[PDB]
């Protein structure tokens, strides 16, 4: 009965070299707890630009983006306490182990790292007992699974996934989307998922089509 994210008439304009280019053009999106909303469209339609806006990674050049429960917080503080990022690349820190990839978020949030919680979440993502593995001992799917768990470490209300199945075959990518959908439902997360594989829309509650930076 209360939205998590509200993007109202948002637009982003980057300086493309000497000239300017309208990346996002009057985007309007609202996500409620427990929704998985996909964002579909060709490469370069403004999917990633909309995602970065939803993740407070850059302010829109026009329009407003409000994450309820985080009012009165800077962009960085909003990401730290209310958003979990499932980057396109797993973005695992080389020198840390699978379990350490979760604890470091706790540390940057200023809390004593929780080893038990990290192992429970790693098991929830299907890596039970692999907390000691290093990045060299993790497969492509496994790294993406650790990434999902890391987004869940801070217990956010908004989960943003940026094409997390881009380097995974059909089987592995299904598992990740199933995991993403299952986690979205189990923890009442509001999740934006950018994807170009229309085969994954079956797991999403809704989808937005995008072209030339305009949402349809």
């Amino acid at each position: 009965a209360a939205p998590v994210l509200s993007i109202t008439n948002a637009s982003v304009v980057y300086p493309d070299g000497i000239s300017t280019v309208t990346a996002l053009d009057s985007a309007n999106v609202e996500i409620f707890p427990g929704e998985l909303v996909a964002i579909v469209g060709e490469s370069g339609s403004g999917k990633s630009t909309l995602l970065s806006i939803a993740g407070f990674l850059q302010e829109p050049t026009s329009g407003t983006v409000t994450l309820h429960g985080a009012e009165g917080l800077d962009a960085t503080s909003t990401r730290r306490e209310h958003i979990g990022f499932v980057f396109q690349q797993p973005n695992l820190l080389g020198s840390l182990t699978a379990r350490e990839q979760l604890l470091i978020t706790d540390h940057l949030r200023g809390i004593k790292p929780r080893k038990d919680r990290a192992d429970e979440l790693l098991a929830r993502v299907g890596l039970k007992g692999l907390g000691g593995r290093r990045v060299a001992q993790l497969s492509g799917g496994q790294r993406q699974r650790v990434n999902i768990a890391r987004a869940l470490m801070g217990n956010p209300q908004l989960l943003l996934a940026d094409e997390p199945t881009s380097a995974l075959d059909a089987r592995l990518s299904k598992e990740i989307v199933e995991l993403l959908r299952d986690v979205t439902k189990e923890f009442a997360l509001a999740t934006l998922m950018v994807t170009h594989d229309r085969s994954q829309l079956a797991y999403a509650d809704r989808f937005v089509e995008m072209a030339d930076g305009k949402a349809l």
């Binding site: 990674l57 730290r80 990022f85 973005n91 820190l93 940057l108 940026d162």
Partner: protein, 341 residues
């Protein structure tokens, strides 16, 4: 500070190379520091031991006073009241068994010697214990001092003047050994001078009295300049390395920024990693430094205390921290969108 410390664990190779460079520079600085203090005490330990307030010299042509050319006449000594004439000369000492050149200081008979030297000025010459052993001479044996036969009055500890040990003799004996009618070479004043000096006279502080020694200023200054360059080189080495290094972490720093890591967190992480690396390098350099110096302090003049090893060490480490913050400044400007690519 979380990622920074574990980066070091998993990549100890890269840091060992750089930490060794920092350790070498600290080693050189720590050992250069000890050598400059050792040589400084080699030239000034005797005069410093006497702890005079002011020192009256004699000049020619209004030039700067020099211990090699100053003499105090008897009337000149009577002018300055409450003052004792000190004669400083270097000449050849020859015993029945050996010989060498040494410095000879002469003071009025009965003047108490500094606790550094102990005893009191006696008739004849008081030899340093090490010098008496070298010459196979005992108390009461005749020795040739500057072409004159003098009796060894006793043994004493060793102080130095111009890299030579000081033989202490009575003012009368020094005149015979140095072939001078003067009552001394300088005038030591323990209280503040209440008389104005003569055209040929010049009052100087204890520090300036060392500059009247030929080798002291021209050799300590050059050693200090090397130390200044070494401190500068250390600072630049850290800044040069750490700027290139922090650029290497942009990707990992961007990921933490995207996750929500504050600027304060990222800056503490980077500086924390550098501080640990700089600490290791400085500790090893200063550790090896004091050891090599103590191992060498028998062949080369080397003054080794706590402040002469840790003073420079802490200075170098703090210079590195100032340099490190300059190099890590750009950790807070990393755009977090670098992680989405």
């Amino acid at each position: 500070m979380f990622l920074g410390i574990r980066d070091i664990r998993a990549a100890a190779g890269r840091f060992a190379l750089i930490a060794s460079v920092v350790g070498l520079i600290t080693l050189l600085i720590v050992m250069l520091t000890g050598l400059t203090q050792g040589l400084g005490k080699q030239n000034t330990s005797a005069i410093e031991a006497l702890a005079p307030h002011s020192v009256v010299f004699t000049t020619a042509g209004g030039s700067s006073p020099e211990f090699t050319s100053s003499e105090i006449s008897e009337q000149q000594a009577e002018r300055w009241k409450d003052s004792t004439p000190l004669g400083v000369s270097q000449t050849r000492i020859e015993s029945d068994q050996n010989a060498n050149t040494t410095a000879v200081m002469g003071l009025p008979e009965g003047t108490p010697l500094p606790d550094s030297v102990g005893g009191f000025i006696e008739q004849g010459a008081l030899l340093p214990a090490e010098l008496a052993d070298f010459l196979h001479v005992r108390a009461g044996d005749h020795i040739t001092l500057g072409g004159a036969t003098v009796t060894v009055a006793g043994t004493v500890k060793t102080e130095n003047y111009s890299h030579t040990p000081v033989v202490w003799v009575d003012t009368a004996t020094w005149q015979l050994v140095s072939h001078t009618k003067a009552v001394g070479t300088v005038l030591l004043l323990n209280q503040e001078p209440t008389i104005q000096p003569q055209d040929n006279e010049v009052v100087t502080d204890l520090k300036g009295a060392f500059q009247a020694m030929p080798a002291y200023k021209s050799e300590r200054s050059s050693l200090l300049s090397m130390q200044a360059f070494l401190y500068i080189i250390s600072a630049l080495v850290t800044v040069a390395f750490l700027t290139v290094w922090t650029l290497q972490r942009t990707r990992d720093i961007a990921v933490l920024a995207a996750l929500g890591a504050s600027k304060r967190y990222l800056l503490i992480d980077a500086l924390g990693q550098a501080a640990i690396i700089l600490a290791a390098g400085v500790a090893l350099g200063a550790g090896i430094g004091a050891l090599l110096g103590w191992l060498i302090a028998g062949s080369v003049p080397f003054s080794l205390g706590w402040v002469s090893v840790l003073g420079p060490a802490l200075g170098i480490w703090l210079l590195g921290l100032i340099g490190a913050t300059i190099a890590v400044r750009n950790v807070t400007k990393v755009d977090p969108q670098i992680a989405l690519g």
